[PDB]
Amino acid sequence: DEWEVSREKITLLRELGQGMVYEGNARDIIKGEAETRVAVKTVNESASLRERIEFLNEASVMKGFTCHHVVRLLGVVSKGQPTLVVMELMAHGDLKSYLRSLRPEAENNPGRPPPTLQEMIQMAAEIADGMAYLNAKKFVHRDLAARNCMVAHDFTVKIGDFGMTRDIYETDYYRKGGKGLLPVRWMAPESLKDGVFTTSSDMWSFGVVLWEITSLAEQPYQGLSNEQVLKFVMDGGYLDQPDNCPERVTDLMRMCWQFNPNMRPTFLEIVNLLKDDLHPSFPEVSFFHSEENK
Amino acid sequence: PYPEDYGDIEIG
Ligand SMILES: Nc1ncnc2c1ncn2[C@@H]1O[C@H](COP(=O)(O)OP(=O)(O)OP(=O)(O)O)[C@@H](O)[C@H]1O
Ligand SMILES: [Mg+2]
Q1: CATH number for region A90-292
Q2: SS3 of A115, please?
Q3: What are the chain B neighbours of A230 within 8 Å (beta carbons)?
Q4: Nearest-CA residue for atom 4 of ligand 1
């Protein structure tokens, strides 16, 4: 295990978010830093066997990823117990919490204004870039949502939470019909109907993330139950535009919610569309502009 | 967290 870290090197400092995720200190985990502030994901004591398997699969999946716009795995403590999954600390947490913090009357308002158009475009491009990388690696995410995007110290947004991520190298799709605890308000109609997941169904969720950004993470299809959303979306229903939502973002959103998955854009197309409206560091860090995007 | 962001439904 090239990913193995000595347990004595990890110190837990506080709880970040409920398996408990912790903020920790890790000594000698990153070259050139004697000690690094990290996030540490662990498994509940009462986690079912399915949950324990999925947690280990999630950690394993992360080992293959290297992208500025994807949350970095730093190491694994797997000798003895319990298993610690060590990753890049995202100083501003998840995008859903962050966005809700930016509401005018939010108790925890950080005293910074809500996102500008440029900032929303930057977020979009970063999320789409991370997803383009994921897709090129032949994985489908399956749970793309603001709550699973993370915000760095410099407000860079990165894809996280790979709990539902599946390898699609052989066929370009993952199919799982049946009953599950599922992110219904984020799911494509063909996923709901046929149980099929593809990069195009991740694109539907991307549309919902855009909607989250411009609504400051309102709940999608508010007033509708889970079972009504299921019916509504399968029947060709989609979300209405948020108040004062910029037209350019609306246009994108609608393209993401084409009923026919074949008609939705790809993640490379999203980045390409936005590429001239981004911070100058973007081509230095993006998968899009990288030699790997071949 | 956001447990309300998931519900028990059937797909497929
Ligand atoms: N690397 C990180 N840095 C900072 N905060 C994090 C990090 N990972 C998670 N968090 C915080 O904790 C919350 C839960 O994390 P995450 O979504 O990865 O766990 P989960 O929802 O239990 O995952 P799963 O869907 O696999 O069960 C996030 O929404 C975020 O606020
Ligand atoms: Mg999550």
Answers
A1: 1.10.510.10
A2: coil
A3: 9
A4: A90
